[PDB]
């Protein structure tokens, strides 16, 4: 486990495009916002792009090295009881339409938020965010 | 933020366009660091650091676009350099100069005899 540390860096904006001529340099596009790590009287500054951040769909990612090893929990074909807390109308042919308050059996809690559920004789995908444990 | 964190690194396999402000856009091949995993199917990530050396002159403060020296400081060229632009100065190793402005972008204003102009600071040394 690591320890997070925030280093307050001065920020600047690129006024023109810059193309790398050597490996330790960084390309710039007009308007890029960068953080300054170290300044050199040579006129060269060691910088890093101000990183973008935010919520993204897990399903759009794969592990760096073990991309074939699935990280999902195992299915539970016996099923676990949940109830729909918000109605949802299936869009895709493999999705399940539920009304608010309907009870279902969760059989696969996929990491991507689209869980496999069972409702009587029907099986399909349903948003985990619209389900709550009974 | 949190006391401790194990940061996991993943790779984007498809392009993603943000539909709300709290999301992040992705381009295939992007390398991201995962901060928090939600059972909702959303993971909070930051793009892996991209860094390197860049020219100070290509930068400006986030806010805004922004004296004569008659007695220059003695320096000597340590490496030959031939002027590229018309306002640059050509020097051979060993040639002494007067440094007028020690500008931070690596191109100092110098003077030698009846010539003045810009010269790489990295090729000058105090004399």
């Amino acid at each position: 486990l690591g320890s997070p540390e925030f280093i307050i860096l001065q920020t600047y904006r690129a006024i023109a495009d810059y193309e790398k001529t050597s490996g330790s340099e960084m390309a710039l596009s007009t308007g890029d916002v960068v953080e300054v790590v170290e300044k050199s009287e040579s006129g060269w500054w060691f910088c890093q792009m101000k990183a973008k951040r935010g919520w993204i769909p897990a399903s759009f990612l794969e592990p760096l090295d073990s991309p074939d090893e699935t990280e999902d929990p195992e299915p539970n074909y016996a099923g676990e009881p949940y109830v729909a807390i918000k109605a949802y109308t299936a869009v895709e042919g493999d999705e399940v339409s539920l009304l608010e308050g309907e009870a279902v059996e969760v059989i696969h809690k996929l990491l991507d938020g689209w869980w496999v559920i069972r409702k009587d004789d029907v099986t399909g995908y349903f948003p985990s965010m619209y389900l709550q444990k009974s | 933020s949190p006391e401790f964190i194990i940061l996991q690194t993943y790779r984007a396999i498809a392009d993603y366009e943000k539909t709300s402000g709290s999301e992040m856009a992705l381009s295939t091949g992007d390398v991201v660091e995962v901060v928090e995993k939600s059972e909702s199917g959303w993971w909070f990530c930051q793009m892996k650091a991209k860094r390197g050396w860049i020219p100070a002159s290509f930068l400006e403060p986030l806010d805004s676009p922004d004296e004569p020296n008659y007695a220059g400081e003695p320096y000597v060229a340590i490496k030959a350099y031939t002027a590229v632009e018309g306002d640059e100065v050509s020097l051979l190793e060993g040639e002494a100069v007067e440094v007028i402005h020690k500008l931070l972008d690596g191109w100092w204003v110098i003077r030698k005899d009846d010539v003045t102009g810009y010269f790489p600071s990295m090729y000058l040394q105090k004399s």
Binding site: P57, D112, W114, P127 | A14, Y16, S22, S40, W42
Partner: peptide
């Protein structure tokens, strides 16, 4: 808190 809509289906 994550977005208030489910993520897209996998690509």
């Amino acid at each position: 808190q994550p977005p208030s809509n489910p993520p897209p289906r996998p690509p």
